Design a protein around this ligand. Structure first.
Ligand code: NI
Ligand code: NI
Length: 160
């Protein structure tokens, strides 16, 4: 399955690995499908590292799962932050996944087994490039200009 994030700076198609991270997938797709991320900004943008979003409050402290409470990590030896465009859930320690997620800008091995990887950017890399060059407050890494996720399209699999 895949989703396309329609942002102020372009679209980003992300393939989600539902066979390895079923709960993370269910959560993400449910939030996407219920317009939960619509209007969300990319609140933390760190060039060379990653960009974070998925917090309706836009502070980096908010957001919750489709279950109204944090859920468990789903780590996998098959899923590592070893390339640009890996998509993972942000957290505040073990099993504290909510709604926030981030997209890496490059290989970041230190993140492995610390955050639940659940997707990969498969199209719209130019959009990721645009996000990475966005001017930010060099102290908080918050983009000087709000960049939002307008809406998200879920590519329904023809198969039931
Ligand atoms: Ni669009
Ligand atoms: Ni706004």
């Amino acid at each position: 399955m895949s989703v396309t994030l329609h942002t102020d700076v372009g679209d980003i198609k992300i393939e989600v690995f539902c066979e390895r991270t079923p709960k993370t997938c269910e959560n993400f797709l449910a939030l996407c499908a219920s317009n939960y991320y619509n209007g969300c900004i990319f609140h933390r943008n760190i060039k060379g590292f990653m960009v974070q979003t998925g917090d309706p409050t836009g502070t980096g402290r908010g957001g919750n799962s489709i279950w109204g409470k944090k859920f468990e990590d789903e780590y996998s030896e098959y899923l590592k932050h070893n390339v640009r465009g890996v998509v993972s859930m942000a957290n505040n320690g073990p099993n504290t996944n909510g709604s926030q997620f981030f997209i890496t800008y490059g290989k970041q091995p230190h993140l492995d087994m610390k955050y639940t990887v659940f997707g990969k950017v498969i199209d719209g890399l130019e959009t990721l490039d645009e996000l990475e060059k966005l001017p930010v407050n060099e102290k908080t890494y918050r983009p000087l200009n709000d960049v939002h996720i307008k809406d998200i399209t879920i590519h329904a699999n023809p198969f039931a």
